[PDB]
Amino acid sequence: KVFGRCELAAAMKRHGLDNYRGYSLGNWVCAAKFESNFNTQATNRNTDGSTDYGILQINSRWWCNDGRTPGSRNLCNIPCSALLSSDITASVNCAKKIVSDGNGMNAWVAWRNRCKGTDVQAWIRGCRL
Ligand SMILES: O=C1O[C@H]([C@@H](O)CO)C(O)=C1O
Numbered sequence: 001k002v003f004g005r006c007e008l009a010a011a012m013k014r015h016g017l018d019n020y021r022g023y024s025l026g027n028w029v030c031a032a033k034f035e036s037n038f039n040t041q042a043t044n045r046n047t048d049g050s051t052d053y054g055i056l057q058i059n060s061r062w063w064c065n066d067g068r069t070p071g072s073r074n075l076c077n078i079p080c081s082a083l084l085s086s087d088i089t090a091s092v093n094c095a096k097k098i099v100s101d102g103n104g105m106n107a108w109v110a111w112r113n114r115c116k117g118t119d120v121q122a123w124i125r126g127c128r129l
């Protein structure tokens, strides 16, 4: 599923992301834009052999089992494919674990490089929330 911007904002808000660990909703929307272009089906292979999955490009090295990432972990206790569903629940629950891991949203390279220090509230502007 490819989300509209405001559609994803509302879904993220309903799933408890707005100010989760102090990151306002716009941060999450901005991350999702630059990680996946709002597409739940996005996958991208990493140089180390792991793969990133879903709207927040959660990686198989640590967070999910894709059956092909030797010596990796499954810290969210889920098959990576669950991160591709049109229901974002798994991606949200797993994101919450990630953002609590010590580095906050810096865990998302694209957040740090495209969203951090920018006017992230622009991403939820005009949305009914
Ligand atoms: O993604 C993973 O891949 C391996 C295994 O399933 C295949 O090597 C593993 O233990 C994971 O969490």
Ligand code: NA
Residues within 6 Å of the ligand: 060, 061, 062, 063, 064, 065, 066, 069, 072, 073, 074
């Ligand atoms: Na894994």
